[PDB]
Antibody, heavy 217, light 212 residues
């Protein structure tokens, strides 16, 4: 039952303040300290520091002194991470892990994503990608999801009934907005015989876009 | 503070074989080193602590050794659920430092990429946009280059690339190269090609179309 539950994702502008919580349960909170680990998107793990749950004393690393602060409320068994004057470099996922003997980090949290950007919430523009007017045993279709914010987005084919032969590519940033694409490869006899529909859901803007791939002509 | 460097960021090996991950330290850390596993979904769990000792719940196929400045994580036989990124962590001195990380990937036979080019959607053109998407699916190894030629001229600016992780089933890779540009820039030419240079072929794979 020992688990660490953090807060949800955060969307902040450059210069603002963010506070990340870390709910502890299943054990006596004052028995172990809490660590904080930073991970920039596409990069490795970086140990920020830890805080003693008895003395409330933080211990920061090299590149985490000045704008960072560890705090906790023992009456609620929750540790807090705070970053002041947010910068673009702070855009990362922040983990919390319970400290133990032999200097190990155990019972990690699910991580709290923090995105520092000036971009507003934008619904994705979903476009269908049909192949050129022309041959072959298989045919590849595509679906473009362009210009949305923030993450995540969910893309399915034919409401899930089409799972095999699907390649959904990771979102790529472009002018403070995300862009995603997906490809599906099926036999040449099933399309345009059956209908291939692209399903894109963006919960951040409550958007559910269906998009049939129609042949060019 | 101590610098922890894992000399190999990427590592390929077949399933069922023995794999070893090296972890070097700038100074002696007296066997005070731990190992962590981060699954592709993001979850992090402890595997080995104090060089050799396994953690509770960790399969017996895992093991750790080394002393002084050089340490290693070893899997007797590689399993499909072991495909993840492994980080080493020292704790001899504060502050604690993680390694660069080593991503484990499965080795397979070389495969030629299936290239597919897609002209701008008619719906996108009505909004002033014109993204030329080029798919390169199911290939091996991971290394591959894409070249965009427009009317015979190489286009290097405005290219958006995305690579997927190693495929769960056939252990292949895929890339999505998009040529993002406006409708005006699109209607200035007509010959849009997508060249794919790969290990499996001496001559590049070309996919093109026209605005005809």
């Amino acid at each position: 039952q020992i688990q660490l539950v953090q807060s949800g994702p955060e969307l902040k502008k450059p210069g603002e303040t963010v506070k990340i919580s870390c709910k502890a349960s299943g054990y006596t909170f004052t028995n172990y300290g809490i660590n904080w680990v930073k991970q920039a998107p596409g990069k490795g793990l970086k140990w920020m520091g830890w805080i003693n749950t008895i003395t409330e004393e933080p211990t920061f690393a090299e590149e985490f002194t000045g704008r960072f602060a560890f705090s906790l409320e023992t009456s609620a068994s929750t540790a807090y991470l705070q970053i002041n004057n947010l910068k673009n470099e702070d855009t990362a996922t922040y983990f919390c892990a319970r400290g133990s003997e032999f200097g190990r980090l155990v019972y990690w949290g699910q991580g709290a994503s923090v995105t520092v950007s000036s971009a507003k919430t934008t619904a994705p523009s979903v476009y269908p990608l049909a192949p050129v007017c022309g041959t072959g045993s298989s045919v590849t279709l595509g679906c473009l999801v362009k210009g949305y914010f923030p993450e995540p987005v969910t893309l399915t084919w034919n409401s899930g009934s089409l799972s095999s032969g699907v390649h959904t590519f990771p979102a790529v940033l472009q002018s403070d907005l995300y862009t995603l694409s997906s490809s599906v490869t099926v036999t040449s006899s099933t399309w345009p015989s059956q209908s291939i529909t692209c399903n894109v859901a963006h919960p951040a803007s409550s958007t559910k876009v269906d998009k049939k791939i129609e042949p060019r002509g | 503070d101590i610098q922890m460097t894992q000399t190999t960021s990427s590592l390929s090996a077949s399933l069922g074989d023995r794999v070893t991950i090296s972890c070097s330290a700038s100074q002696g850390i007296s066997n005070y080193l731990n190992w962590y596993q981060q699954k592709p979904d993001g979850t992090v769990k402890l595997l080995i602590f104090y060089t050799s000792t396994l953690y509770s719940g960790v399969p017996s196929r895992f093991s750790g050794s080394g002393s002084g400045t050089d340490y290693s994580l070893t899997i007797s036989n590689l399993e499909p659920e072991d495909i993840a990124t492994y980080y080493c962590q020292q704790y001899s001195r504060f502050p604690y430092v993680f390694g660069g990380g080593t991503k484990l990937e499965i080795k397979r036979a070389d495969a030629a990429p299936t290239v597919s080019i897609f002209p701008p959607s008619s719906e996108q053109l009505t909004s002033g946009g014109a993204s030329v998407v080029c798919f390169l699916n199911n290939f091996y190894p991971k290394d591959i280059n894409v070249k965009w030629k427009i009317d015979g001229s190489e286009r290097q600016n405005g290219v958006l690339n995305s690579w997927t992780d190693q495929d769960s089933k056939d252990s292949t890779y895929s890339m999505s190269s998009t040529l993002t540009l406006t409708k005006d820039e699109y209607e200035r030419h007509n010959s849009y090609t997508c060249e794919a240079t790969h290990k499996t072929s001496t001559s590049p794979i070309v996919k093109s179309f026209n605005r005809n």
